[PDB]
C-alpha cells in the first residue's frame, strides 16, 4: 500500500550492521593495552643502556683512503682528522668494496636509530658509528649512523671526491649508484648538494629524478643543487601555505628534498620494505625509498653512503 | 500481526540503542587511551636518540710526550694525544702513568697472539694493531712517531722493556740513551749503553754457540730496521722474511719481540717456517725456543730515573 | 489525527538516528586508520630504541586484523540509510 | 736466530 | 987587592941586604893579602849555597776541588793539592780562581801542540802533560782523578769547554750534571743536558752529511772512554787507534779535544793518516776540518751557575 | 992558601939564586890581582841568581817506580811522597837505564854546587834536582844534588830497595856499581849505611874497600856499617886527637868515612879529573873519587847514585 | 991587624946574610905552594857558583906556569951556600 | 769524525 516503509527490515539490517560495529570497536580496545604493556617494556629496558668498546686502531690518516694506503686493511671503525684543525673523530672505513678506502657517511641496516631528527643532530652527526663483533676487542661492524653535515660537507671540500651509495631490498638484491663528483656546502649554503658522473644500477634518482615520473612531477623530485632540509628547518621547493606541506616532516628524515624526493636514504625504517599510506604516519613516502629502483612504497632493507677521494 | 509484528518493534528501537551511547563509550575512551599512548611512545622516542656508549674514552691533556703529559697532572693510564716537537700532525698514544709521576710512552705490546707482527714496511712505519685504555690491547706504534719522540729535543731517552714468560715472572732490561733515526736512515736503532734490568742485555749480541761469531751477529745496537719488503740487515739473505716480523736484524737477532707469537712458551724446529726460531725471544733470560707470554717497550726521558738532589 | 499520521512522527527520529550512524562510521574508520598507523609508528620506534637501550622489545605487527576490519567496515559504509 |  | 977587593966587599953586604927586611914587607903584605882573601871567598861561599830560585811555586791550601779551596780563601789561579772525599792519595792540579769567588778545577788544555795525546790507557787514567801556576802549557789530568772529583758527594758539577780558533775568537759549551765513571766502566761520560754556550752542543752529535746516521753516531754522552790500547767504543774498528788519541768514541765524534794539533787550524785529508778527520774539532762550531788553536776543560760545582743565593 | 975562602964566588952565586926568587915572588904578586878580579866579577854575578821554571807533571806516585808504572815515561823532575804523611818533594827520575824507575839520590856532573856542606843541609838535601832543557816547558834536566839523608834513610826503608851507582870518567868511558842491597838508617843511628849483593865494572868500593890498598890499609877504606860524617859533625872510624884528624874536612864532602875513604862521590869535583896533594886543599884525596876503579887523585866527570825498590 | 984580618971581618956577614936567602927560598916555597892551592880553590869554588848564581865566570887553570916555577925554585934550592 |  501507499508506501509500506518497511523498515522493519531495519530490525534485522541495524542489528547485524551492529554487531561489526561493535565487535572492532573493541578490538581496538584491545590492542590498546598490548602496545601500552610494549611501551611500558620498553621504557623498562631503557633504564639501562647500550654499549660498546671500540678500541682504536693504530694506523690513521685524513680519511679512510689515506688509511688503506697507510697499511690499513680490515674494514672496521677508524680514527681519523681531515683538516689539521679539526678534532678527530670515529668513522667506519669499508676496507673492501671497490677497492676500499671508502668513508662511510651514512648507513642504514636494521632500524636501529631514529632518524627524524632535528637540523642540529644532522649537523653534529648522530648514531653508532661502530659496533663490537662476536666480542673482539674491535668494532669491526657499522651501526647506523649519520657523519653530520659539517664533517661530510669539510670532506667533500677536501678535493674530488665520490659518492657511492648502495642498497638491497628485502630479497637479498643489490644494487649501487656511483657519483665521480660529490659535494655539500657549509652550513652557510644549507648543505647543499651537488653530483655527476652517475654510473650504477639503481637508477639516478638523484641527477634524474624519478623514471616512473613524468614531467612537472619527475623534475621536482631530481636532488641535485637542492639544499638540506629537517623537519625543523625546512628548504625544499614548495610553497610557504604554513606549516602545511613540508616534504620533510614529524620523524621524517632530513634530506635534500626538491618539490619532494626520488630517494630518501634517511626515511622510515619499515620492516619487510613494504609499507602502505595508511601505514605511514603522514599517509606519505615516509620510508627508505628509492624509486627509481623498487619504487614508492618499498623500504629498502639496506642502504648506505660512502665516499672517497677521486685522485683520477 | 497488526499491533503485534510492531508491537514487537515500535518499543525494539530501545533494545539496539543500547549499542550506540555504548558503542561511544569506547569510541570517546580508546581515542584518549591512543592521545596519552602517543604522549608514552613519545617519551620512548625520547630515551633512544642517544648511541650505545663506548667504554674508550680519550683525555684531553697532550703533551710532547706521556712524560710531558704526567707533569700537566695526569693521573691514569690511558689513551692521550701526543705532538713531538718536530712533529707536525699529533697522535693517539698509550700513556702508563705510575704513582710515582712516571709517565711512560709505550710503543710496543704484545700479550695474546691477537695481532699479527708479520707487517710490511709502511705497516711498520705508520703503527698498526689496537690501543686500549687499559692497555689489554697488542700493537706496534710506527717507527716515524717512535723516531720523532725520540728524537724531540734531543734530551736522554731510556728504554724499558718488560718480559712475563708464561709462569707470570717478569723481568726488565734498560736502555740509556735510546733512540730511532728517521726513514732515510731506516729508522736505525742506537742506544747509549745498557743500564739495568734483569733480564739481560739481549741487545750486546749472545753466544749462541752454533758458531763463534753468533755473539757479535746478534748485537742490535746500530742496526737498521728490516721488513720482508725491506731489507737493510746484515744477513745476506733477510732475516725478516724467514722470521716473519719487523725488526732490527744484525744476520738476525737474540732479541726478537716483533717474532711470532707461540702459545704456552716452548717452540720447536718443526714447527717453523725456515726452521730458524722466530718466537718472540729474548736469549739473555731464556732460550732461543722459549717465546715470552707478555712483551712490553716502553720510553720515558732518561733523567726521570737517574734521579736526584 | 493520532492514526497513520503518526507515520512520520517516526520518521525524523530514524533519519535522526540513521545519520548518527553514518557519523559514526567515519569517525571508526579514522580512528582504524590512526591505529594501524600508530602500531606502525610504535614497532618501528621500539625497534629504534635497540641502538640506545640495553634491551629491545621483541615483537612484530599484524595489519591483517586491520585490513580485514577496514573491509568489514566499507562492506557497510557502502549501505545507503 | 744467529744464522750460520 | 988586600984591603981593595975586601974593601969592595966588606960594605957589599949592606948592598945586597936591601933585598932581606925589603923580602919580608912582601913575606909579612902578601900573607896578610891572603888572610882577609880567605875572608873574602868566605863571603863569597856564603853567597852561593842556595839552589837557583824555581819560580813554580805551589800553595800550601787544599780542599776537595778548586771550588772548596776557593771558599777556603784563594784569590789566584796556580797549582794545588786536592784530595777528593772517595780518594786515598791526593794531587796537585791547576785551580782557575776567578774575582766573583769561582773556583774553576781545570783537567784539560790544550795551546801549543807541545805534548803528543796520543797515550795510551793507563797514559790517560793516571794523566800526562805539565802542569804550570800561569795555565800556560797543554797537559790531561787523568781518568781517574776526574772521576774521583765528579763523583765525590755526588752533588752537581758542571762542565766548561772553552774554545779559541786561530783567530782569537772564543766560545763555550756547558753540561750540567756532569760526570765520569770508574775504570770499572771505562771511565764512561754523562751529563744531564747541554746548558749555554755559544759553541754549540757538539756532544749531542752533529749531521755531518756523509750519511743519516752520523748525526747519533757521533754523540757522546753515554759513551765509554777509548785509547788505540783499550777500545769500548760503538764503531767497529778503533776511532782512538785510528784519530790518534783518547776521546770518548762513539762510531767515533764530533767533538775532538784531545785531537792531533794541527798549526794554523785548517787541515786537509791527505795530511791524516787513515784520511779520516783528527784534528781537535768541535763540529757545532767549526768545521770537521778546522782544528781549534787553544782548547780548555774545567769543572765547577753546577750551584755555582744556576744563580739562586749562597748560603 | 990555608982557606983560601972563595965565597967570592958567592957574588956571582947570590945574584943568580936571586934573580929566581925575585922572578917567581913578583910573579905570585901578579897572580892575586887576577884571582881578586875574578872574585869581585864572580860576586857581582852573584847580586842576581840563576832561575829555572820546572812545571810539574802530572803523574805521581810514592816513588820513581811506581811512577814509571803509571805510565810516566819521560826521564825527567817528578813529585813524588812516599809516606802518606810527608809533604810532596820534588825529585828527578831516571826513566830508561836499566827499565827505568829510578830515583835519583845524588848527582855530580859539572861542578856547580858546593857539596862541602855542614850536618844539616846533607839532611834536608840541596843543590839544584833539575833545570829546563834547551827552553821547553819542563825540567828534563837533573842538576847536581843531593836529595837529603832523611829523605833517602824513609825511601830504603819502606822496602827493599837496590842502589845503582854509576861514574864516568873524563875520557867518556863509564862504568857501573849496583848494590841488591841497600839502607840508610834514621838520624838516630847516624844514617848508618848497608849494602849487600854488589854486581858491576866499577869495583866494590863499598864492600870490599880499595882493591889496591892490603889488609890494614884496606879494611880501613871499607864503607859498610859506616856512619854519616859531616866536617861539622864527624862519625868516622879514627883516634879523637882533637880538630886533627877527621876524613870529612873544610868544603870536603859529607860521606860514610871509615878511616877515610875507597869512594867518595860527594868529594871536591876537581876540572880534568886529575890532581894532586898540592891542588888539594889539605893535601888529601880531596875528589870524586872511586879508588878501585880509577884509584885515588882521580875526579870522574860524572858520578850518580839511584834507588829503587827491588820487587824480586 | 987591618991587612988580611979582615978576611973573616966580611965573612960572618956572607953567612948572615945566605942565610937569610936559605930562609927566603922555603918562604917563597911555600908561598907558591899556597898559590897553586889557591888558584885551584877558586876555580873549584867558582863553578860551584854556577848553581845558585844568575852567571859563573868562564875560566881555566894553568898549574903550568906553577909546575915549571916550583921547579926552577927547586933546581936553585939545590945549592948548599 | 763518524767513519762510511
Ligand atoms: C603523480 C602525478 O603525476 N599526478 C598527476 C598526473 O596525473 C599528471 O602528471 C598530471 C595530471 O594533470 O599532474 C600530475
Ligand atoms: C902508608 C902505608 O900503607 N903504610 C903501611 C902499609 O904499607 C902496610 O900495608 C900496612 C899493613 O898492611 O901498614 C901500614
Ligand atoms: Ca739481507
Ligand atoms: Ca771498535
Given at each position: 500500500?501507499?508506501?509500506?516503509?518497511?523498515?522493519?527490515?531495519?530490525?534485522?539490517?541495524?542489528?547485524?550492521?551492529?554487531?561489526?560495529?561493535?565487535?572492532?570497536?573493541?578490538?581496538?580496545?584491545?590492542?590498546?593495552?598490548?602496545?601500552?604493556?610494549?611501551?611500558?617494556?620498553?621504557?623498562?629496558?631503557?633504564?639501562?643502556?647500550?654499549?660498546?668498546?671500540?678500541?682504536?686502531?693504530?694506523?690513521?690518516?685524513?680519511?679512510?683512503?689515506?688509511?688503506?694506503?697507510?697499511?690499513?686493511?680490515?674494514?672496521?671503525?677508524?680514527?681519523?682528522?681531515?683538516?689539521?684543525?679539526?678534532?678527530?673523530?670515529?668513522?667506519?672505513?669499508?676496507?673492501?668494496?671497490?677497492?676500499?678506502?671508502?668513508?662511510?657517511?651514512?648507513?642504514?641496516?636494521?632500524?636501529?636509530?631514529?632518524?627524524?631528527?632535528?637540523?642540529?643532530?644532522?649537523?653534529?652527526?648522530?648514531?653508532?658509528?661502530?659496533?663490537?663483533?662476536?666480542?673482539?676487542?674491535?668494532?669491526?661492524?657499522?651501526?647506523?649512523?649519520?657523519?653530520?653535515?659539517?664533517?661530510?660537507?669539510?670532506?667533500?671540500?677536501?678535493?674530488?671526491?665520490?659518492?657511492?651509495?648502495?642498497?638491497?631490498?628485502?630479497?637479498?638484491?643489490?644494487?649501487?649508484?656511483?657519483?665521480?663528483?660529490?659535494?655539500?656546502?657549509?652550513?652557510?649554503?644549507?648543505?647543499?648538494?651537488?653530483?655527476?658522473?652517475?654510473?650504477?644500477?639503481?637508477?639516478?634518482?638523484?641527477?634524474?629524478?624519478?623514471?616512473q615520473l613524468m614531467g612537472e612531477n619527475r623534475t621536482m623530485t631530481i636532488h641535485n643543487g637542492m639544499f638540506f632540509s629537517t623537519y625543523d628547518r625546512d628548504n625544499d621547493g614548495w610553497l610557504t601555505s604554513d606549516p602545511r606541506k613540508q616534504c620533510s616532516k614529524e620523524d621524517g628524515?632530513?634530506?635534500?628534498?626538491?618539490?619532494?624526493?626520488?630517494?630518501?636514504?634517511?626515511?622510515?625504517?619499515?620492516?619487510?620494505?613494504?609499507?602502505?599510506?595508511?601505514?605511514?604516519?603522514?599517509?606519505?613516502?615516509?620510508?627508505?625509498?628509492?624509486?627509481?629502483?623498487?619504487?614508492?612504497?618499498?623500504?629498502?632493507?639496506?642502504?648506505?653512503?660512502?665516499?672517497?677521494?677521486?685522485?683520477? | 500481526?497488526?499491533?503485534?509484528?510492531?508491537?514487537?518493534?515500535?518499543?525494539?528501537?530501545?533494545?539496539?540503542?543500547?549499542?550506540?551511547?555504548?558503542?561511544?563509550?569506547?569510541?570517546?575512551?580508546?581515542?584518549?587511551?591512543?592521545?596519552?599512548?602517543?604522549?608514552?611512545?613519545?617519551?620512548?622516542?625520547?630515551?633512544?636518540?642517544?648511541?650505545?656508549?663506548?667504554?674508550?674514552?680519550?683525555?684531553?691533556?697532550?703533551?710532547?710526550?706521556?712524560?710531558?703529559?704526567?707533569?700537566?697532572?695526569?693521573?691514569?693510564?690511558?689513551?692521550?694525544?701526543?705532538?713531538?716537537?718536530?712533529?707536525?700532525?699529533?697522535?693517539?698514544?698509550?700513556?702508563?702513568?705510575?704513582?710515582?709521576?712516571?709517565?711512560?710512552?709505550?710503543?710496543?705490546?704484545?700479550?695474546?697472539?691477537?695481532?699479527?707482527?708479520?707487517?710490511?714496511?709502511?705497516?711498520?712505519?705508520?703503527?698498526?694493531?689496537?690501543?686500549?685504555?687499559?692497555?689489554?690491547?697488542?700493537?706496534?706504534?710506527?717507527?716515524?712517531?717512535?723516531?720523532?719522540?725520540?728524537?724531540?729535543?734531543?734530551?736522554?731517552?731510556?728504554?724499558?722493556?718488560?718480559?712475563?714468560?708464561?709462569?707470570?715472572?717478569?723481568?726488565?732490561?734498560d736502555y740509556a740513551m735510546f733512540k730511532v733515526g728517521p726513514e732515510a736512515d731506516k729508522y736505525r736503532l742506537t742506544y747509549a749503553y745498557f743500564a739495568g734490568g734483569d733480564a739481560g742485555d739481549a741487545f750486546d749480541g749472545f753466544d749462541f754457540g752454533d758458531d763463534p761469531s753468533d755473539?757479535?751477529?746478534?748485537?742490535?745496537?746500530?742496526?737498521?730496521?728490516?721488513?720482508?719488503?725491506?731489507?737493510?740487515?746484515?744477513?745476506?739473505?733477510?732475516?725478516?722474511?724467514?722470521?716473519?716480523?719487523?725488526?732490527?736484524?744484525?744476520?738476525?737477532?737474540?732479541?726478537?719481540?716483533?717474532?711470532?707469537?707461540?702459545?704456552?712458551?716452548?717452540?720447536?724446529?718443526?714447527?717453523?717456517?725456515?726452521?730458524?726460531?722466530?718466537?718472540?725471544?729474548?736469549?739473555?733470560?731464556?732460550?732461543?725456543?722459549?717465546?715470552?707470554?707478555?712483551?712490553?717497550?716502553?720510553?720515558?726521558?732518561?733523567?726521570?730515573?737517574?734521579?736526584?738532589? | 489525527?493520532?492514526?497513520?499520521?503518526?507515520?512520520?512522527?517516526?520518521?525524523?527520529?530514524?533519519?535522526?538516528?540513521?545519520?548518527?550512524?553514518?557519523?559514526?562510521?567515519?569517525?571508526?574508520?579514522?580512528?582504524?586508520?590512526?591505529?594501524?598507523?600508530?602500531?606502525?609508528?610504535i614497532d618501528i620506534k621500539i625497534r629504534s630504541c635497540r641502538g640506545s637501550c640495553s634491551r629491545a622489545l621483541a615483537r612484530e605487527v599484524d595489519l591483517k586484523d586491520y585490513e580485514d576490519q577496514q573491509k568489514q567496515l566499507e562492506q557497510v559504509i557502502a549501505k545507503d540509510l | 736466530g744467529?744464522?750460520?
Amino acid at each position: 500500500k501507499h508506501q509500506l516503509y518497511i523498515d522493519e527490515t531495519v530490525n534485522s539490517n541495524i542489528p547485524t550492521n551492529l554487531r561489526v560495529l561493535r565487535s572492532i570497536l573493541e578490538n581496538l580496545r584491545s590492542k590498546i593495552q598490548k602496545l601500552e604493556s610494549d611501551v611500558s617494556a620498553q621504557m623498562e629496558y631503557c633504564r639501562t643502556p647500550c654499549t660498546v668498546s671500540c678500541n682504536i686502531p693504530v694506523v690513521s690518516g685524513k680519511e679512510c683512503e689515506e688509511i688503506i694506503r697507510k697499511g690499513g686493511e680490515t674494514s672496521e671503525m677508524y680514527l681519523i682528522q681531515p683538516d689539521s684543525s679539526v678534532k678527530p673523530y670515529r668513522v667506519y672505513c669499508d676496507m673492501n668494496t671497490e677497492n676500499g678506502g671508502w668513508t662511510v657517511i651514512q648507513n642504514r641496516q636494521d632500524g636501529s636509530v631514529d632518524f627524524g631528527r632535528k637540523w642540529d643532530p644532522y649537523k653534529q652527526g648522530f648514531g653508532n658509528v661502530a659496533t663490537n663483533t662476536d666480542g673482539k676487542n674491535y668494532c669491526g661492524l657499522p651501526g647506523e649512523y649519520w657523519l653530520g653535515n659539517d664533517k661530510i660537507s669539510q670532506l667533500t671540500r677536501m678535493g674530488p671526491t665520490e659518492l657511492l651509495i648502495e642498497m638491497e631490498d628485502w630479497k637479498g638484491d643489490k644494487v649501487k649508484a656511483h657519483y665521480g663528483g660529490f659535494t655539500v656546502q657549509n652550513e652557510a649554503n644549507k648543505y647543499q648538494i651537488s653530483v655527476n658522473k652517475y654510473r650504477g644500477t639503481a637508477g639516478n634518482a638523484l641527477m634524474d629524478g624519478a623514471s616512473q615520473l613524468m614531467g612537472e612531477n619527475r623534475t621536482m623530485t631530481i636532488h641535485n643543487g637542492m639544499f638540506f632540509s629537517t623537519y625543523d628547518r625546512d628548504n625544499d621547493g614548495w610553497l610557504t601555505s604554513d606549516p602545511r606541506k613540508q616534504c620533510s616532516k614529524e620523524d621524517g628524515g632530513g634530506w635534500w628534498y626538491n618539490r619532494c624526493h626520488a630517494a630518501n636514504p634517511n626515511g622510515r625504517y619499515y620492516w619487510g620494505g613494504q609499507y602502505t599510506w595508511d601505514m605511514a604516519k603522514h599517509g606519505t613516502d615516509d620510508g627508505v625509498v628509492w624509486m627509481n629502483w623498487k619504487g614508492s612504497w618499498y623500504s629498502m632493507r639496506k642502504m648506505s653512503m660512502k665516499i672517497r677521494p677521486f685522485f683520477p | 500481526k497488526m499491533l503485534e509484528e510492531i508491537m514487537k518493534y515500535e518499543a525494539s528501537i530501545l533494545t539496539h540503542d543500547s549499542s550506540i551511547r555504548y558503542l561511544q563509550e569506547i569510541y570517546n575512551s580508546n581515542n584518549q587511551k591512543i592521545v596519552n599512548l602517543k604522549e608514552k611512545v613519545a617519551q620512548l622516542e625520547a630515551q633512544c636518540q642517544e648511541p650505545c656508549k663506548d667504554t674508550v674514552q680519550i683525555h684531553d691533556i697532550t703533551g710532547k710526550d706521556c712524560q710531558d703529559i704526567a707533569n700537566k697532572g695526569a693521573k691514569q693510564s690511558g689513551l692521550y694525544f701526543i705532538k713531538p716537537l718536530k712533529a707536525n700532525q699529533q697522535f693517539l698514544v698509550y700513556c702508563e702513568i705510575d704513582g710515582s709521576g712516571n709517565g711512560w710512552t709505550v710503543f710496543q705490546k704484545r700479550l695474546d697472539g691477537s695481532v699479527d707482527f708479520k707487517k710490511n714496511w709502511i705497516q711498520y712505519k705508520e703503527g698498526f694493531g689496537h690501543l686500549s685504555p687499559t692497555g689489554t690491547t697488542e700493537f706496534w706504534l710506527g717507527n716515524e712517531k717512535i723516531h720523532l719522540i725520540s728524537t724531540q729535543s734531543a734530551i736522554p731517552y731510556a728504554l724499558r722493556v718488560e718480559l712475563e714468560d708464561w709462569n707470570g715472572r717478569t723481568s726488565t732490561a734498560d736502555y740509556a740513551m735510546f733512540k730511532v733515526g728517521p726513514e732515510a736512515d731506516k729508522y736505525r736503532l742506537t742506544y747509549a749503553y745498557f743500564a739495568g734490568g734483569d733480564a739481560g742485555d739481549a741487545f750486546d749480541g749472545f753466544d749462541f754457540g752454533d758458531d763463534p761469531s753468533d755473539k757479535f751477529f746478534t748485537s742490535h745496537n746500530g742496526m737498521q730496521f728490516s721488513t720482508w719488503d725491506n731489507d737493510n740487515d746484515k744477513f745476506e739473505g733477510n732475516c725478516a722474511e724467514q722470521d716473519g716480523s719487523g725488526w732490527w736484524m744484525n744476520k738476525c737477532h737474540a732479541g726478537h719481540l716483533n717474532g711470532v707469537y707461540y702459545q704456552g712458551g716452548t717452540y720447536s724446529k718443526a714447527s717453523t717456517p725456515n726452521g730458524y726460531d722466530n718466537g718472540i725471544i729474548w736469549a739473555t733470560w731464556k732460550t732461543r725456543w722459549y717465546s715470552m707470554k707478555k712483551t712490553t717497550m716502553k720510553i720515558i726521558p732518561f733523567n726521570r730515573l737517574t734521579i736526584g738532589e | 489525527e493520532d492514526l497513520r499520521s503518526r507515520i512520520e512522527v517516526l520518521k525524523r527520529k530514524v533519519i535522526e538516528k540513521v545519520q548518527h550512524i553514518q557519523l559514526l562510521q567515519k569517525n571508526v574508520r579514522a580512528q582504524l586508520v590512526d591505529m594501524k598507523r600508530l602500531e606502525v609508528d610504535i614497532d618501528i620506534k621500539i625497534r629504534s630504541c635497540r641502538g640506545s637501550c640495553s634491551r629491545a622489545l621483541a615483537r612484530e605487527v599484524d595489519l591483517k586484523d586491520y585490513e580485514d576490519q577496514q573491509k568489514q567496515l566499507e562492506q557497510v559504509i557502502a549501505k545507503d540509510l | 736466530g744467529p744464522r750460520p
